[PDB]
């Protein structure tokens, strides 16, 4: 399935993912596209912070056809 990520500029990228994919797996894909180390990423879905050992299915990524995660840059 495809998801969007809103990036630090408010633009979107698309990732090809499966519901069982971990948040750590998603953050690695975001690192490859946006150059943010995973330990400096905070990923949000519907205002909820996503935890690295959990999966997209844990956050019900399947409920909607179109989903946008939000990338935030941890503060220094």
Residue numbers in the entry: 1 to 76
Article passage:
The Ser/Thr protein kinase PINK1 phosphorylates the well‐folded, globular protein ubiquitin (Ub) at a relatively protected site, Ser65. We previously showed that Ser65 phosphorylation results in a conformational change in which Ub adopts a dynamic equilibrium between the known, common Ub conformation and a distinct, second conformation wherein the last β‐strand is retracted to extend the Ser65 loop and shorten the C‐terminal tail. We show using chemical exchange saturation transfer (CEST) nuclear magnetic resonance experiments that a similar, C‐terminally retracted (Ub‐CR) conformation also exists at low population in wild‐type Ub.
To overcome this and to generate exclusively Ser65‐phosphorylated Ub in the Ub‐CR conformation, Leu67 was mutated to Asn, and Thr66 was mutated to Val (termed hereafter Ub TVLN mutant). Ub TVLN was phosphorylated only once, on Ser65, showed a clean, single‐species bTROSY spectrum highly similar to Ub L67S in the unphosphorylated form, and when phosphorylated was highly similar to the phosphoUb‐CR conformation (Wauer et al, 2015a). Together, this showed that Ub TVLN is an excellent mimic for the Ub‐CR conformer. Hydrogen bonding patterns observed in the crystal structures matched the experimentally determined hydrogen bonding pattern for the phosphoUb‐CR conformation (Wauer et al, 2015a), and the phosphoUb TVLN structure is similar to a recently reported NMR structure of phosphoUb‐CR. Likewise, in phosphoUb TVLN, the Ser65‐containing loop is extended and seemingly mobile, with the phosphate group exposed making no contacts to the Ub core. For Ub TVLN, we observe ~99% occupancy in the Ub‐CR conformation at 45°C, with an exchange rate of 120 s−1. PhPINK1 interaction leads to almost complete protection of the entire Ser65 loop of Ub TVLN showing that in the Ub‐CR conformation the phosphorylation site is part of the interface with PINK1. Hence, phosphorylation of the Ub‐CR mutant Ub TVLN is ~45–140‐fold faster as compared to variants where this conformation is much less populated (wt Ub) or disfavoured (Ub L71Y).
